[PDB]
């Protein structure tokens, strides 16, 4: 009654900002349903991009202390944490500025509100204020939206664990990103990649740590190899990493939070923290719109399934992003948007989940796609593998990563390249490589024959596949 | 009558041991002739890995001075010049080491010697010792090996200039490489990658830059705005930037080396350097090796042409690498050596030269490979491009290189992508994914459905493919 629009996009994160940009291209009418006044979700104010600006800066000190054994010598850096977190912050405020600009260039409109169904054609917004991300309230004025069509993209929340009470010593990864101190003894609660990088950066910046993870390592779903490496060379920063370890109390005190753990070789008298972190996952919020109003179906873990064209149940509602399912990741997000939205313009369009890569931005980088050792192992299927020792590459020999690797997983019927795994700088930039052979179906002989220049890291990619051949001669004989 | 092999391969470098390391593991008997005690030639020894970690190292010296304006404060280096050399001559000694070890361990007879050709089935080999690359001299002693198969391999020289004199101040890339000190004035004759990558080294060290060239720009090959947007970051380090300018005269004297230059926008008054670069391209050695007493046709020029199995006029002699044309750099080298080394064992095997990559290591990388927009224009070929700047990439604003781009060169009439290049770091472990993309033949829906993960540098590539499609949404609408 108030509005009326081809396509409403609910959120306005990768997912929903991508949606509504590309159905402005189509020329449909579009608007954005954001609470918080910036756009680009979780992935820009408080997620991705502020993360990996820590970590990249976090990294070159690392390597700064590597510097003086080849006759470069610096002191240790003076660190000023405000223009830290202000270098971080006016990243992002740079980011989200462009957004809106670009919004308005497409003529996009952006309703500053919390949206709920009204019914399967309209949406309730009570209309927020606050110009901070996370932090705006509702002023009390209600709009109701109609709409063709309707983008679900209202992402996910950090995962909460009851036992846990409220102290402003227990943080999660909007608490790290904001930087308030560097705590003298950190733990992290979960194995998960989130955590382990924010921890890396205090690391780097002063910090302990102590990691607990329930399961049976860190990083679930890496192949173990590629973890083992990492934990290796980041062994020296954690004075405890506990796995098959239960968190059984939290008890925050005068001096620090003390924390319990029960595990085989966990220790057994509660641990003193300065800070606690929880990193033990995210959860979707399908159940926080008011869907079933719209018709639209909802798990009881909150997730909105649909089908490859992103279709809800219900026929002109879609859905994308964190709240569909996992991976929980950010270019997932962005190109299920474009599905949707060419859906909404009438183009019949199908997202293919099955070449979805994943990367932990910690040092060294791990990046892999496809089929895992593990998922191999778990589905029954035959697979042959070929690694490429980073011991052998005069790049990484002259840049001082020689412990990575570089690992292809084929079929072992058919021979296409169905997976990969990289650890050791730049594997988020090089990955995309694999990921696109096995949308080709590339086999070994194609990537092998395919010419990559030297020194490089990414050489590595072309003579991994050469080692599945048989015909590495940068390696002892095959 | 000394020896009797099934392939003897004439010159260790990167062509030479992996063609002897690959027939040897297709079980032939192989000897290498190399004039120096090491092997991996000019490339290990002289070439791209001592200049890709003096450059690696500079790098990071760049990027700490960039820290200071994000909280992260460090002084001036203090630079040891003999700790930094011995760090760059470690790192060789461990590879020429490895090389060793594996020739010993394939059971591939290593040869100190010149080889010269004495009839279409012998080598006359003048013994040589020394233990230093460069640095050897004849003992007198001869030795006759006698083969069924030949792969020559012996490489390239610095071009020389009739004009130039003799003085300690005047050197060539292993002069530089030497690192003896740091100039305060450093002159490079020659706008090509080689002496670029070398001023940056010495750049950072501390040494003022000029450079000069005959030919209109630096990087002859580059696409012009890749090297524009090189030479605008690289400004500073440079006092004159002279293209289109003759070198008249270098006189050496007591205080400097002078050197006059004849050009629209040189200065007319002799300019003073404490050293001065020769890097004005490199020589094949096809006239050195007495190659028509075994009946191989040589090139004025000094190449020696060869087919797609990389064979002589001669059948049963085959070369490879540099000897044969260009490009002259490693990664062809060895892919021809692998082609060579299987026709000697009776498998057809032809090598494709369509797409090799190039990169400068320089800061920013410059990596472009197939079809560019020089040589599209020279040739007539209609082509489409799409450009991605990393002004629009969230990881490069976070890191500091938002003036970087990848761009991509597709044939009008077919769709399918023919070449590409990118400006900014990491170019080179990224533009395999472009190789890949040619030799598959992919068009700009195949790269761009291709799901690359976020924030990278790396997604660029299949941004740039969203562009040729009209559908980037991080971009203003196409
Ligand atoms: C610390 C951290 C690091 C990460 N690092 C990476 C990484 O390196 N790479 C990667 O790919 N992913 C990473 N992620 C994950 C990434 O942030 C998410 O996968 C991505 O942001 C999800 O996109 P989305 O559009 O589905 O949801 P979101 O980004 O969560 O956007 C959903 C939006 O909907 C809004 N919203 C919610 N409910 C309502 C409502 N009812 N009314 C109105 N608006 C509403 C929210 O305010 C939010 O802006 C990281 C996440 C975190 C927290
Ligand atoms: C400063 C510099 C930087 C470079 N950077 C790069 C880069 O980053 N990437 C890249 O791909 N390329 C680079 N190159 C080029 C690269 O080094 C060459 O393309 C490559 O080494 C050629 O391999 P090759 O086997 O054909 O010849 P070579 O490496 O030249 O090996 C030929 C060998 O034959 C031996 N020989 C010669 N004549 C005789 C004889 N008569 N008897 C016995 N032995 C003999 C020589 O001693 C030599 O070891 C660089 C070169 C230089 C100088």
């Known amino acids: 009654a108030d509005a009326e629009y081809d396509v409403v996009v609910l959120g306005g994160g990768p997912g929903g900002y991508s949606a509504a940009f590309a159905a402005a291209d189509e020329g449909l009418k579009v608007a954005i349903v954001e609470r918080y006044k910036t756009l680009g979700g979780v992935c820009l104010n408080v997620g991705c991009i502020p993360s990996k600006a820590l970590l990249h800066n976090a990294a070159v000190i690392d390597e700064v202390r590597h510097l003086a054994a080849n006759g470069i010598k610096y002191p240790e850096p003076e660190l000023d944490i405000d223009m830290l977190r202000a270098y971080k912050d006016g990243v992002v405020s740079r980011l989200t500025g462009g957004l809106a600009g670009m919004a308005k260039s497409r003529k996009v409109d952006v309703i500053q509100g919390d949206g709920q169904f009204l019914d399967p054609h309209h949406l309730e917004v009570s209309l927020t204020a606050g110009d901070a991300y996370e932090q705006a309230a509702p002023t009390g004025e209600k709009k109701i939206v109609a709409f063709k069509n309707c983008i679900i993209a209202a992402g996910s929340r950090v995962t909460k664990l009851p036992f846990i009470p409220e102290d402003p010593r227990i943080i999660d990864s909007s608490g790290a990103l904001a930087l308030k101190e560097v705590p003298g003894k950190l733990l992290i609660i979960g194995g998960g990649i989130i955590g382990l990088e924010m921890g890396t950066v205090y690391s780097t910046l002063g910090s302990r740590l102590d990691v607990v993870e329930m399961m049976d390592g860190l990083m679930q779903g890496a192949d173990r190899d590629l973890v083992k490496v990492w934990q290796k060379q980041n062994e020296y920063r954690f004075d405890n990493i506990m796995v098959n370890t239960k968190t059984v109390a939290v008890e925050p005190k005068e001096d620090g939070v003390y924390v319990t753990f029960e595990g085989a070789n966990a220790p057994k008298e509660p641990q003193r923290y300065d800070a606690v972190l929880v990193a033990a996952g995210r959860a979707p919020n399908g159940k926080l719109i008011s869907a079933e109003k719209a018709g639209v179906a909802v798990t009881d873990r909150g997730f909105i399934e649909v089908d490859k064209q992103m279709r809800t149940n219900v026929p002109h509602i879609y859905a994308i992003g964190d709240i569909v399912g996992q991976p929980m990741l950010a270019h997932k997000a962005v190109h299920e948007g474009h599905v949707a939205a060419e859906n909404c313009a009438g183009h019949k369009a199908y997202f293919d989940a099955r070449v979805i890569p994943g990367v932990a931005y910690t040092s060294p980088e791990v990046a892999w796609v496809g089929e895992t050792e593990l998922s191999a192992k778990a589905s029954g299927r035959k697979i042959t593998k070929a690694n490429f020792p980073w011991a052998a590459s005069g790049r990484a020999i002259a840049n001082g990563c020689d ?44 990537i092998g024959k395919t010419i990559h220049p030297h020194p490089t890291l990414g050489e590595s990619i072309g003579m991994a596949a050469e080692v599945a051949l048989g015909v590495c001669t940068d390696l002892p004989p095959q």
Chains 1, 2 share one sequence.
């Open 403 to 446: 412990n990575g690797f570089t690992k292809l997983i084929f079929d072992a019927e058919t021979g296409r390249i169905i997976g990969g795994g990289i650890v050791g700088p730049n594997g988020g930039d090089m990955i995309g490589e694999v990921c696109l052979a096995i949308e080709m179906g590339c086999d070994a002989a194609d």
